[PDB]
Every structure is written in C-alpha cells, then in structure tokens.
Design a protein around this ligand. Structure first.
Ligand SMILES: *Cc1cc2c(cc1C)nc1c(=O)[nH]c(=O)nc-1n2C[C@H](O)[C@H](O)[C@H](O)COP(=O)(O)OP(=O)(O)OC[C@H]1O[C@@H](n2cnc3c(N)ncnc32)[C@H](O)[C@@H]1O
Ligand code: SF4
Ligand code: F3S
Ligand code: FES
Lengths: 241, 119, 573, 130
C-alpha cells in the first residue's frame, strides 16, 4: 500500500556547536506498529546520521530509552506514533543536564542509587547451607518495589527533583526501601542516614507524578511515603532514647 | 558528589503534626464547615440547637474544650506546613520561612489554648 | 593516551562480566579491577531473559540427568569435561544468587520453585516470574556496588586489545561522552561481550549485541569455535522479532496452524498432550530446533496464517498468566495487540542465540595467555550444536565465576612485558580509528547493515542449501569491500553514535562471514545446523564429530580448522 | 579541556502550569488556604463566644455577610477535595500482606470514607437533635 507520514519535532543539541537546544523536523513513515524508537532509527538511517540517543532492548525492560514526548516522560520504544498525529515533540529527558541530542548526564542518578547501599547486608548465610527461606508472604512485602529498570522517567516527572537536584530521588528511595523490607537483609541502619536527610524522603511532597509515569508500575510514591513512616519511627526512636 | 554523613533532618516532627492534622481535617472538617459556616448563619437548624446559650453550654464542657482546640489547632499545623512547602514549590523566597509559618502555628496554638481555658 | 593501571580488566558488564568482577574482587581484596561497558550495566542484554536458569534442585534429580540433557541436547558437540563441571556448579551459583537477594519465585513453604524448559525431563529451572534475566542482572549489578576493587568505566567503548608475544596487556577504549581514548593496562582480560545476534535482520536481541568481543578476538588470531550453529527461537513476534518466552509452553501453551491443528505431533513430537498437562520433550516442549523446523514444513504445506503460527494460552487462566507470565501478557498487548487471555499470539521462529564464540579451554582462557572469554561471547564448549534452553544464564555465573577466579590468578603470575611494543600497539589502535574517521566514499553504513541482515537470514537460516550459503558468502564478501567506502559524516566527539555503530557493523561483517563460511563447510546436519542437499541431511559422526574453528587472517580471508570433541562417559550413538 | 557543554534546562516558578497532573497537585496543596482561614474563623467565634452574647451575635452577623457565605462555601469545597485526595494517598504509607499479596489501597480508602460518613452523622445528630 502507501504509508502515512508524521511530522516529528525532535530537540537537537551539539555541544561543539550550539549555544543551546536547536529544534528540528523530520518526515517519518509510520503505521500502527511504529514506535518513537522506530522513528529515531529511521531518521538516523536516512535523514540525519548525526542523531544520538540511548537504546537497546526494544521491549520496555532495559531502561535506556528515556525522553520527553509532548512534555510527558515516557520510553520511546513503548511510545507509538499512532497517538501523535496532531503533533509530536521529543525532548531529552527532563531535569537532567543535556549532553548531546537525546542523551542526558545520568551521573546523579547512578550516584544516588549507589548512595543507599542496594545489596544484601549482614546475612552470614553461606551457599553450602542452602538458600534462605522466604515465603511469598515475606516476598510480597517488597516484590512490587523490585521491578525498577533504572530508566529515570520519574526523575523527569518529579518537580521536587527539578527544584532540588540534590534530592536523592524516587527510584533510589524505592530501592533502599526494597532492601529494608526483604526478610533476608539486616542493614536498615546503614541506609537511614541517607533517607533521614533533608535530601532524603523529606524532600518529597507527595506530588505523585512519579508513580504515574512509571512504565513498570513500581509505585515509588508508595515506597518513599512508607519511608517517611520509617524515617519517622527512627526519628522517634533516636529522639526518645 | 553526594554526601557521606548528612544531617538527619527534623521534618519527621512537622510531618508528624501535619500528618495528624491532615487526617483530622479529612474526617471532621466537612461537617464542621457545614454546621458553622452554612447552617448556623442560615438558621437551617431545629429550634435553638446553634443558639448562643447552647454553643456556650457546649464550649464550656470538657469534651467541648478538647474538641474546639483540636478542631482549631490540628488543621493549622497541617495548612501551614503545606504553605511552607508551597513556597518552595512556587520558588518564593520567604526569610526565616520555617520560623514565620511554624511560629504562627505555635502563636495561634497558644492563642487558642488561651481560648479553650476561656477568656 | 591517558593510562590507568588495573590488576585485570573485564570487558562487558552482562551477567557473565559482572560475576567475573565480583569473583575477581572476592579472590583478591586488594585487586583494582576495571569493569568496562559501552552501556550502563543494567542495560545489558541479560536483562531481557524471561525463561529461567538451570540447576539440579529436586530430590529426584541428578547431576547425570542434567549432564545427559545437555550433551544430548547439543548433538554431542559438547566438551563433556566442561559440561560435567557446569552442572556440578549450577546449584551453588543459583543459591549464591539467592543469598544475594535475587527474588526467586517461591513454593509456599519458602523454598525456591522450579519449572521446566529446554526439553529437560526433570524440571530444574529456577525463576523470578517471567522476568528472570531482569532479576538476575540487577542482583549482580547491585551486589557488585559493594566491592571498591571494582572500578567501572560506564559508557566506554572498548576499541581493541593490546597483545604482544602471545600475552595480553590491556585495552584501548573510547570515553563515549568525552570522545577521548583511554589506555587500560592489565595482565588478564576477560571478554564478556555477548553474542552476535544482530547480524540477522530479525533477531530477539537488543541493538548492542553486535558481536564486538568476538570480532576483536578474530583480529588477534583467536578462533571462533562452532559459529555455524545459530539457534532460532521458535516463538517470536512477526516483524519486531520480540521474544515470547518458552515459559508460555512450560505453563501449558499450545502451537497451532491455520487449521487449529497442533501440527507438532506430525513431526516426531507426538502424541498430542491434553490442554491440561504439558509433558517434557513432547509437542510444544519438543526439541528446540524441531519446533522451529516444523514451522518451515507447515509453511511448505501452506498451513501458516498470512506468515505466522499461533501460540494459544487462553486455557492458562488469569491467576497463572499474571503470576508467571506478566511480561509476556503486556508484550503481546502492545506489539501485536493481543490479550493472552482473550486471543492467541502470532509467532514464528527468529534468530536468537549464537552457539559459537571465542574458543576457550576449560578455564575460559583463549590461546593468548591472559585473555579469557566467558558468556555468550565465548565457546567454553558447553552447548555444542544446540543450546539447552535455560542453560545459558547458568553458564554466565558458573563460568563467570571461573573466569573471574582464573583471570585473577593469571594476572598474579603474569610478569612484565615490552613497554615500547605495547604502547606501539596502543598507538596502532589510535591510527586505525583515525583512518576510519578519514575514510570517505559516500556509502551509507545503515544500508550495509540492512543487507548483511537479509543475507544471514536468507543463507544461514533454519534450513540451509549450498547455493544460498554460497550466495551469502558472496554477498558478505561484497559487503566487506563496500564497508571501506563508508563515510562517517558525523565528526563530533560527545556521544557520537554515528561512529560507534559503524564500528559495531565492521565486527558484524567479520563475525557473520565466520558463520557463513563455517556452515558452508560443515557438510552435515547437526543441531541448529540443518542441510537439505544430498549427503548432508543427517548427522555424520564419522566425518564431523569435531568443532569448527574459524580464523581470520590479515588479508581478510576467513580460514577454517577443526578440533576433536572430548568424550568422557557418554559416547555418541 | 573537554569538549562538553552540559546544557542545564532551568526550572521556572510556573513549572506546575504546564501538565494537568501538576495542576491538580497545586490545587490539592491549595486546599491549605481555606483550611487555616476556617481555623482563624473558629478562633474568632471562640473569643466572641467568651465576650458574651453581644459579641457572639456580631460573629453570626459576619458569617451571614454573605460574601463570607460564599468563601465558607469554597472552604467546604476545598475540605472535600482534601478528604477525597488525602484518602487516596494515605494507604500508600502502609505495606500490608494478606495471604502472600500486597493489598490496598481500595480496602483502606473504603474504610476511611465509612468513618467520615459515620462521624458526619454522629456530629450532625449531636449538634442538632438536642
Ligand atoms: C536476547 C535474549 C537472550 C536470552 C533470553 C531472551 C532474550 C530475548 N532468554 C534466555 C532464557 O530464558 N534463558 C537462558 O538461559 N538464556 C536466555 N537468553 C540468553 C542469555 O540471556 C544471553 O545469552 C546472556 O545473558 C548474555 O549475557 P552476557 O553476560 O554474556 O553479556 P550481555 O548481557 O549479552 O552484555 C554484553 C556486555 O558487553 C558490553 N559490550 C558490548 N560491546 C562492547 C564494546 N565494544 N566495548 C565494551 N563493552 C562492550 C555491553 O555493554 C554489556 O556490558
Ligand atoms: S520507579 Fe519506574 S520510573 Fe522510577 S526509575 Fe524505577 S522503573 Fe523508572
Ligand atoms: S514526584 Fe516527587 S515529591 Fe515524591 S512522590 Fe514523587 S518523588
Ligand atoms: S529499549 Fe530497553 S528500555 Fe527502551
């Protein structure tokens, strides 16, 4: 047959040449299976070979994809042009420094996530002794908070993060929470120092956009909140003794 | 980049009151604005339910002084919390903003505590 | 070039690499290990694994039944001394993953459940719903954060390795953000860079699985073992190639043609089983290849739906679908528009896994002293002519650990090398990068990419013919000429993916020629490698029970050698 | 010297004006103004109640204004929105397992609305039927 075309607006930036973001427009063929990631590949194949963007897996599990689409944080490989016939506008993932085109400086993300210690601490059990015993009951305590693919859409959601780039973030808070609530760990006190910081849970105002854009339904807003409970118990504890 | 030994904050105190305050004004406020803000001045009540002698007969009882202090003070510590943070959100720099808002809350808290031990 | 010293470098932060980094940090607390990758470690292809991972667990299993299931599943091309070590260490590494917090799906009593894959009579695949790769790559990446020994070089694109007098000495990588090169000196290097499945037009893999680690080993005289065995996943979404786990059949799911016939009984995996109870080795849980081949035969008889077949799971139920196939549900819903509860899912075979990889002994060392290979990039000789589904992920951590331990010893007895020689190698990578940047010609790399995919798909497919193979050898050698006329029109330095993809393609051409030449030479039919022509339509243990080694000389001729299969207890028959 | 140019996008005090979800979030914290105004009001009526029926009659005269009846109607709007939204967000602060499954929030939002209905009925009944 004959494929339709969509005027896609993508936000370009080359730090060796521009003084700031420089917009563009590309005619992209499409049908009912074409993603934004399919479009970015096409543009780079036939329209602008110098166009850069992160990607890999193509099936919404890797998390490199992240970028704004009509000012919504979303994964390109799960965004489809069929829904943007009246306009589209890809911008590099919000609240992050832009390094080039659709790629952003994820440094603060990785340092945050590194700063809460996301790994089993204090369990002397050794592989010979067989596995730990943990029910689906103990597992349902944290299982939803474990599906995070470190994509970053919620940092672009969160207006607090935009106002306070020292805020450790929804993801990072959810992850430290995911280990607090695992019956196999014994290192909650090694994490509270970060979570009790002003840049901890207490920089979160329950705006709730984070969980709304999560492509894996982790509900970070639920983890943090539960962390303010906990942070508080710890406040209580410490203060009262 | 990111600190190693950050200062444990103090927000779990305010957040505690703002929590308590937010939950009181969610269950009780709706009926309180109905009664006091609408029925009372519209006389939409049977007989002398909301008449000066009855309201003073209630306010002066023990259960009334406790409820009138909670009705006033807990939503204060919840609203003024939210304002404090609305400020940051709106990028509005208020000097000693922690003192202004929370000091207003304690000011009014004392002022209402004075009131429920009666003038 | 800026230099940094390391006790060992590990290229690739997949499951394999990362386990290697851990072990290597855990074997030498004072080591300074350099783990490098062109993508942040949690973007590695590992994250897309949905089935499970294999290790003997139940009381009625035996290392011998896994041993056997792997040897036989591999058409006896397996180094039986390697497969022995493998199944004997799978239990300890799945357990060690659980000790690190991997959320393995559980039996009600707190024990780890197991389900059935790859045509293994006794079920022994551990899993975390159908997200198992995802839970396994993160458990490892997250657990690695605690070893200061591990220094990462996130989004460094490793260009080449430095070799001299038969020993490896470091590597040259580009800092992808800065566009600068960097020298990493270290006396063991552990390749862990994945398979080469993107050399196919339609594949199951992410955009980064372009083969770079194999192609580097080609350039230093290391030989890709067994590269003609490309396993095809039987159930991939049409067009996208997106993978639908087997765990759609280990849960009872069925494969039907355009007549609703469960055609797979008609091809030696009869009789048909009842909707209710799937039985291992039969029907939709058949031999991998057969389940793919049978698609081809159905397409001959005209029994495909216009061309797909159908994977029906409706008779699975909401609880079971959403508790053990959540991912599969949403994937169907978004890329083909199908509820696995209302409708059936259109699928067909898709290039998936590269059996072949860098040749390694039983220590994952290659012929070059100090250079090791582990993971999908390697061929430690575990899968022979056909990988047992759910054996791959176990490989990553069983041998990942080994590599990590073995690289750690090797670098601790290595002894120095010729500095002027080494730096002259480094200077040699740099020059070559410049020659590529200044190369011109007005050839479009992307168009070469697309043809190389169409050729591998046409000549190195499910069934193979000397005429089409020859045509793909011929197409690829034509493509090798055209690459030299590619012009890299982008000259920037900050995250220049125009340059990098061009580099990944030149690895693909090399690795793909190895596959093509290796298949054209193997005049038999074994495992994934099936030949329609006369005298090559069956296994030939007289003349070909031997590994295919492929080398590449500096004149760009792709030469083959052959080596013997270690047999221990299970003689072919 | 590197060849980078980490372009930082700036955030305006009007960030919430863009996306609707953001706006509903300002609105939901906006209910903070009518809630303290009502607590100011009650303090008035308190100290009017103490200064005798002369002052209390002044107070009821103010409540009738009726611009103050519109404001106190807006206040009854705001307090509902708060209740609606506060009830949705409370359950997330809990992590509860019921036979191997994280539950909520629907069973928690259901109970909170049941209590306020009962509190509203018992309060309307005590201040009016006597
Ligand atoms: C694709 C796939 C594979 C797969 C599967 C499902 C899909 C869609 N399901 C499986 C299953 O159910 N059971 C199983 O046993 N295996 C399954 N597989 C196969 C398996 O996942 C893979 O074969 C295996 O996971 C490979 O992992 P590995 O550790 O070997 O490495 P990788 O994850 O593929 O990542 C490669 C790393 O190398 C780095 N890299 C690549 N090129 C470079 C260069 N040039 N320079 C530096 N680093 C490089 C990557 O960045 C990454 O770190
Ligand atoms: S919670 Fe969701 S949005 Fe946030 S990082 Fe994790 S997967 Fe991404
Ligand atoms: S958007 Fe922000 S304020 Fe908290 S709930 Fe989410 S991190
Ligand atoms: S491709 Fe993996 S997240 Fe978009």
């Amino acid at each position: 047959a004959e494929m339709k075309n969509l005027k896609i607006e993508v936000v370009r930036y080359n730090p060796e040449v521009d003084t700031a973001p420089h917009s563009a427009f590309y005619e992209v063929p499409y049908d009912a299976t074409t993603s934004l990631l399919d479009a970015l590949g096409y543009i780079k194949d036939n329209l602008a070979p110098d166009l850069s963007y992160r990607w890999s897996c193509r099936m919404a599990i890797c998390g490199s994809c992240g970028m704004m689409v009509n000012n919504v944080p979303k994964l390109a490989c799960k965004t489809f042009l069929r829904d943007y016939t009246d306009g589209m506008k890809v911008e590099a993932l919000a609240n992050f420094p832009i390094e080039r085109d659709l790629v952003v400086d994820m440094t603060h993300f990785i340092e945050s996530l590194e700063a809460i210690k996301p790994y089993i601490i204090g369990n002397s059990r050794t592989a010979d002794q067989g596995t730990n015993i943990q029910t689906p009951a103990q597992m349902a305590k944290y299982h939803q908070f474990s599906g995070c693919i470190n994509c970053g859409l919620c940092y672009a959601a969160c207006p607090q993060f935009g106002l306070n780039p020292e805020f450790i973030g929804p993801a990072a808070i959810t992850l430290a929470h995911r280990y607090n609530e695992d019956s196999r760990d014994h290192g909650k006190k090694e994490r509270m120092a970060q979570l009790n910081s002003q840049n901890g849970v207490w920089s979160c105002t329950f705006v709730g956009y984070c969980s709304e854009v999560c492509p894996k339904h982790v509900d970070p807003a639920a983890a943090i909140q539960q962390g303010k409970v906990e942070s508080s118990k710890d406040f209580l504890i410490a203060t009262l003794k | 980049m990111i600190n190693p030994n950050p200062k444990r904050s103090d927000e779990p105190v305010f957040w505690g009151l703002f929590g308590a305050g937010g939950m009181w004004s969610a269950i009780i406020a709706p009926v309180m604005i109905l009664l006091v803000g609408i029925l009372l001045p519209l006389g939409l009540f049977p007989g002398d339910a909301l008449s000066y002698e009855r309201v003073l007969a209630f306010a002066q009882s023990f259960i009334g002084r406790v409820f009138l202090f909670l009705m006033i003070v807990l939503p204060l510590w919840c609203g003024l919390h939210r304002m404090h943070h609305a400020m940051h959100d709106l990028k509005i720099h208020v000097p000693a903003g922690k003192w202004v808002f929370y000091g207003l809350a304690a000011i009014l808290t004392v002022v209402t505590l004075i009131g429920v031990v009666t003038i | 070039m800026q230099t940094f010293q390391a006790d060992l470098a590990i290229v690739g932060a997949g499951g394999a690499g990362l386990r290697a980094a851990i072990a290597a940090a855990q074997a030498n607390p004072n080591a300074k290990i350099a783990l490098i990758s062109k993508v942040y470690p949690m973007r590695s292809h590992t994250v897309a694994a949905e089935g499970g991972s294999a290790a003997v667990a139940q009381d009625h299993d035996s290392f011998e039944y896994h041993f056997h299931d792997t040897v036989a599943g591999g058409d006896w091309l397996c180094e039986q001394d390697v497969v022995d070590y493998f199944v004997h260490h799978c239990p300890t590494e799945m357990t060690q993953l659980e000790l690190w917090g991997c959320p393995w799906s559980r039996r009600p009593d707190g024990s780890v459940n197991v389900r059935r894959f790859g045509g293994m009579k006794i079920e022994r695949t551990w899993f975390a719903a159908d997200k198992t790769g995802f839970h396994m790559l993160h458990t490892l990446f997250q657990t690695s954060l605690q070893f200061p020994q591990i220094q990462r070089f996130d989004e460094h694109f490793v260009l080449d390795i430095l070799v001299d007098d038969g020993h490896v000495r470091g590597l040259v990588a580009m800092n992808m953000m800065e566009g600068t090169l960097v020298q990493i000196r270290a006396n063991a290097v552990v390749m862990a860079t994945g398979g080469a499945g993107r050399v196919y037009r339609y594949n199951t893999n992410g955009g980064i699985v372009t083969g770079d680690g194999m192609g580097m080993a080609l350039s230093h005289g290391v030989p890709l073992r067994d590269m003609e065995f490309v396993q095809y996943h039987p159930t991939g979404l049409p067009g996208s190639g997106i993978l639908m786990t087997e765990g759609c059949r280990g849960e009872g799911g069925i494969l039907v043609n355009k007549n609703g016939y469960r055609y797979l009984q008609d091809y030696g995996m009869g009789p048909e089983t009842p909707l209710g109870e799937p039985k291992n080795k039969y029907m939709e849980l058949g031999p991998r290849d057969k389940v793919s081949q049978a698609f081809w035969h159905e397409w001959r008889k005209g029994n495909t739906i216009s061309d797909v077949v159908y994977l029906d799971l409706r008779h699975l139920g909401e609880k079971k679908l959403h508790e053990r196939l959540p991912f599969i549900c949403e994937l169907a819903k978004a890329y083909v528009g199908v509820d696995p509860v209302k409708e059936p899912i259109p699928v067909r075979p898709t290039a998936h896994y590269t059996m072949g990889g860098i040749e390694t002994d039983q220590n994952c060392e290659t012929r070059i002293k100090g250079l090791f290979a582990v993971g999908e990039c390697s061929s430690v000789g575990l899968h022979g002519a056909n990988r047992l589904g759910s054996n791959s992920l176990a490989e990553l951590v069983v041998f990942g650990r080994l590599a990590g331990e073995q690289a750690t010893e090797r670098a601790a007895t290595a002894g120095n090398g010729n500095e002027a020689a080494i730096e002259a190698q480094a200077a040699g990578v740099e020059q070559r990068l410049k020659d590529l940047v200044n190369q011109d010609g007005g050839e479009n790399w992307a168009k070469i990419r697309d043809e190389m995919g169409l050729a591998m798909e046409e000549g190195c497919g499910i069934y193979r013919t000397p005429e089409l193979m020859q045509k793909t050898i011929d197409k690829l050698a034509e493509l090798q000429e055209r690459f030299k006329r590619v012009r890299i029109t982008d000259t920037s330095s900050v995250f220049n993916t125009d340059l990098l993809y061009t580099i990944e393609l030149g690895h693909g051409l090399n690795v793909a020629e190895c596959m093509a030449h290796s298949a054209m030479a193997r005049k038999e039919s074994r495992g994934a490698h099936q030949r329609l022509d006369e005298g090559c339509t069956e296994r030939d243990d007289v003349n070909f029970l031997k590994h295919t080694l492929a080398f590449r000389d500096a004149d760009g001729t792709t030469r083959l050698e052959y080596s013997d299969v270690k047999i221990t207890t299970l003689p072919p028959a | 010297t590197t060849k980078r140019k980490p372009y930082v996008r700036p955030m305006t005090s009007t960030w919430w004006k863009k996306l609707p979800f953001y706006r509903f979030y300002m609105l939901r914290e906006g209910t903070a103004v009518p809630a303290v105004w009502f607590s100011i009001e009650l303090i008035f009526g308190l100290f009017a109640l103490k200064n005798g029926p002369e002052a209390w009659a002044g107070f009821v005269d103010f409540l009738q204004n009726p611009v103050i009846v519109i404001i106190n109607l807006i206040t009854l709007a705001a307090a509902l929105l708060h209740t609606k939204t506060w009830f949705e967000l409370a359950p997330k602060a809990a992590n509860i397992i019921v036979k191997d499954e994280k539950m909520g929030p629907e069973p928690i939002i259901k109970s909170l609305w049941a209590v306020t209905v009962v509190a509203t009925i018992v309060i309307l009944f005590v201040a009016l039927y006597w």
